[PDB]
UniProtKB/TrEMBL annotation, chains A, B, C:
Signal peptide: none annotated. Keywords: ATP-binding, Nucleotide-binding. Residues 203-217 form the Bacterial type II secretion system protein E domain. It comes from the Bacteria. One of its GO terms (molecular function) is ATP binding. The keyword Oxidoreductase does not apply. It comes from Thermus thermophilus. The gene is pilF. GO terms for cellular component: plasma membrane. This is ATP binding motif-containing protein PilF. The keyword Repressor does not apply.
């Protein structure tokens, strides 16, 4: 067909450019198609309004979606294959004013998961991070907004840690990609298999490592914490702007600070900044007023260099190509446990940690921005500085 | 054709007078016709009682309603075109003791939606408003009664922030304006497309900005907060007499307070006041004693220029033409976060917010009455403070 | 049948090596079986993928699990006896991506039933325990999670109170031990001999002490309570984490509040906590804030020491050797009854009880931990939320 011919090419072009998502959107007069690359959407094509139905058909067919239904959202999955390329897609259709909208999400593979040496950790923090994950039990929290690289990190860790002498059990919503040598369980709300329900079962499963996909309940916060106290390694995900507030979040979710204190081994706060395109990279001579505001001594200010991409055909005008990770790693020690009990605020916990040598998201992004890995713009945007 | 001539004229006059609604009311010995202008009903004309059924007939033909049925309400939509007039009309017929009443609403378009610079924000509030909508994720609430300008503000915001690198998704009941650049979806009961069912689907649609037209049920209030939590920007409308009560209401609706404190960027409480007609505008010497019980200081009573419109042909005698918005903008910071958890009252929150810089509705009203934008009574009639 | 033979061989080999746990894990092309020996998982054997369901059915029948239910976790206990192979198995089935995973833990072979003086009650709590179980009649509830030591405690009580001048009748699912001096009846669902059917018969068997293995009906709860009212002593097992919630549990099962208030002598809640290896004990300097937060008085904090096992040859790798029980004893008085009728919450009731001097599991666990019986972390794990 011609609609079949379009879906093949847009998926192929997405796989070739490492696009995260494909948006097929009807509008007043046309159909716009967009690709998400490096977290940001780009224009790809524009179709005649009549093209919409046939295209939606091709997509819905791939995922076993009902062509008859156009009044309700639908959800499908397809293992898509075209000679060279092989990728799973999650298809989503949504009724819109101008007709159904389709979104195709290209899922990653276990192949794609990095080793912990290739995460982007600075030299000093890397050795601390290597240490905290090597502990035999406790709970290690990874926090940040969606698209922060949190899953990539958690599985990077599990890739180094889940050896055959251990049981590695995972609760996930959904399971994105299957990992060899660990046990994975998928949340099933229709059946009633919730995060809290599966976690309770894990305790009956002789676990060694438990991966909690996401902590939203009080209930899962307690069980995840109880697994930790029981003597297991717990890797879980929380949604917090900061490392320290993960401590306060657990308190508000109802974990008493003495439980938190006896189980929390460390918190990692992750954000994902965009990487300056190499072809169109250009030095910008910077601004002493910022750098001043992130109290970089005025000895490290005129030594400092900053960079931006200019936009070229090789980055679609973006000035960016690929992404990089920035890290705020809070390691729990004997001065911090005491501050968790006694009830210090997140701000107070953080000043202690920083005074021990914790680098913040800002301070990390900046160190990477002074290498031209990313722009100062991107750093202040994803964090708050 | 005489009834056709009347309907033709009254829509023409409503159009030119910026009239929300036309009211055609059967009364004991006549028919009364009123225009709502600036939110206030206004006498337009009187018809002789035996002319009712001809006029209702014209109105029904326009919206394709049944003439035979006079015992049950009816509803229609017409795209009205006469001369240079192009308006969408919503038609309502309803049996009353003296016959059927008719209401025709004149609908606005996307072109009527202002730029955020033209929303009427005081300069100190406007800079904070801007910093609130420019955040990457979180939930921002716009509260107040119907006809307060909630939608105008919402889309004004989306005009500035729904840039083409982002997915901007809408759920609405109904979709009012057709907006370029964004994706809109309408609630559909008959198909089972709830607010909550739509919103659940949005989370598999790779969204950046989410707009929830109205939060009515407890489930929708939870999913929108969740979506904010995970890393999405959410703009939603709520009904509260006060900015602080939007916090409390989410609580009452079932949202975990730790989730509220975590996701909430801010609240905007809004009303509409009437502008002083400036063909009537006559300066009025303020009464200091009355301006003192109203919490204004001695400095503010100086530099106070009050006005009242002495009715004219252009303002229909009311002394007012046009409307203006008054604002109460709660910006969430850490102290408001700690008070949201720990279950402080709305009154407690409010006093925190003010101490931190928030102007109440009354205060923003008074401030603009001293600029002669509006009059004192309008401020007092639109604010219980 | 080939499946049945495999399961018998694995349990045989686990038994003989003294393996802790047996793991049957589906994989992508493979069903992998692992044994945990001396703390580590070792590879036992590999089964083809198409053998998975056959094996899972075998182990489900052994633990009385549902074969049909494949998308929820299940749990059962089994006593495996084939020849010299005699071992209590805890069975756990977990839904995973490649199918159901089954885990079987080999339980430490049950020790002989002790005197109530060796159950490990605190000195003060013990005097109350002794006083509750001396009562001539009424119902005494023993409650807690699976493997709490419930059955072990009830038979220890029966060891003391079941005297030859009394008839002591027992309804069990199933019968575990072989105690002299008493009469024991096992539930036969096949024959129609239910918990409730037996309990009505017991009232025609002239009893003195009745023991119900489990209350999981309304009718059983109602008959057991009725038996307590007429003037029989009833020891019964519930599965509630909190002692005070066990009262609410009976109300949910339909027992009239006034029959609960008149019959309930008290409720025992217990946990099993791992014990520190004596040959390996070290002193830990505890944190005053933590102790304070756990309700310890300033006098007690003064010379408080805590203990940990470092890992010793005697205790394998872990610093723990054997178990000990912690207790929470709710003794019903006149005030409690008044709360039950016109029912206050389990929270209020627990408050009242604590005000009358009732020790909590954590408080009980703490003091035992303060003596070196166990670690705080073991105590915190079994008392969380
Ligand atoms: N360290 C990294 N360096 C560069 N790119 C990365 C890195 N980690 C992740 N990415 C990319 O960014 C995307 C974000 O993926 P994720 O790791 O899932 O982030 P996440 O949203 O925090 O994970 P979730 O939502 O908890 S399942 C990945 O698909 C990769 O394309
Ligand atoms: N800032 C403003 N200044 C002056 N007039 C305004 C302003 N905002 C809105 N209006 C007028 O007031 C009318 C009602 O505003 P809306 O925003 O549509 O009402 P709303 O009830 O607050 O929100 P809804 O219920 O979702 S339409 C608009 O149609 C305009 O005519
Ligand atoms: N106070 C105790 N100290 C040491 N070990 C105990 C104690 N109580 C029980 N145990 C042992 O731990 C196991 C406890 O099992 P039970 O006493 O049967 O518990 P239970 O509460 O009946 O569990 P369920 O739900 O009936 S399977 C038994 O093997 C006991 O031998
Ligand atoms: Zn470039
Ligand atoms: Zn005028
Ligand atoms: Zn030891």
């Amino acid at each position: 067909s011609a609609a079949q011919k379009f879906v093949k090419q847009v998926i192929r072009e997405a796989f070739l450019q490492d696009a995260s998502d494909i948006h097929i959107e009807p509008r007043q007069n046309d159909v716009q198609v967009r690709l998400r690359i490096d977290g940001a959407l780009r224009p790809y094509s524009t179709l005649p309004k009549g093209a919409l139905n046939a295209v939606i058909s091709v997509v819905k067919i791939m995922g076993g979606l009902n062509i008859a239904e156009k009044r309700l959202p639908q959800d499908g999955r397809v293992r898509y294959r075209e000679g060279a390329i092989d990728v799973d897609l999650r298809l989503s259709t949504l009724p819109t004013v101008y007709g159904e909208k389709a979104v195709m999400r290209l899922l990653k593979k276990a192949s794609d998961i990095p080793e912990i040496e290739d995460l982007g950790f600075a030299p000093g923090v890397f050795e601390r991070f290597k240490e905290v994950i090597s502990k035999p039990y406790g709970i290690f929290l990874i926090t940040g907004p969606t698209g922060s690289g949190k899953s990539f990190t958690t599985f990077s860790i599990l890739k180094r840690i889940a050896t055959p002498d251990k049981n590695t059990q995972t609760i996930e919503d959904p399971v994105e990609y299957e990992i060899p040598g660990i046990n994975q369980t998928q949340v099933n709300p229709q059946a009633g298999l919730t995060f809290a329900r599966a976690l309770r079962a894990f305790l009956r499963q002789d676990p060694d490592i438990i991966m909690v996909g996401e902590i939203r309940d009080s209930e899962t916060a307690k069980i995840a914490t109880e697994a930790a106290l029981t003597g297991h390694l717990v890797i879980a995900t929380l949604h917090t702007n900061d490392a320290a507030q993960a401590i306060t979040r657990l308190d508000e979710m109802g974990v008493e600070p003495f439980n938190i204190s006896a189980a929390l081994i460390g918190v990692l706060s992750q954000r994902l900044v965009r990487r300056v395109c190499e072809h169109c990279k250009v030095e910008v001579k910077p601004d002493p007023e910022t750098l001043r505001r992130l109290g970089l001594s005025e000895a490290e200010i005129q030594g400092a260099r900053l960079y931006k991409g200019m936009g070229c055909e090789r980055c679609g005008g973006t000035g960016y190509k690929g992404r990089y990770a920035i890290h705020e790693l809070l390691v729990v020690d004997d001065e911090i446990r005491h501050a968790i009990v006694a009830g210090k605020s997140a701000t107070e916990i953080k000043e202690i940690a920083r005074r021990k040598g914790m680098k913040t998201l800002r301070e990390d992004g900046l160190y990477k921005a002074l290498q031209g890995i990313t722009t100062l713009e991107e750093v202040l945007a994803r964090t708050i500085e």
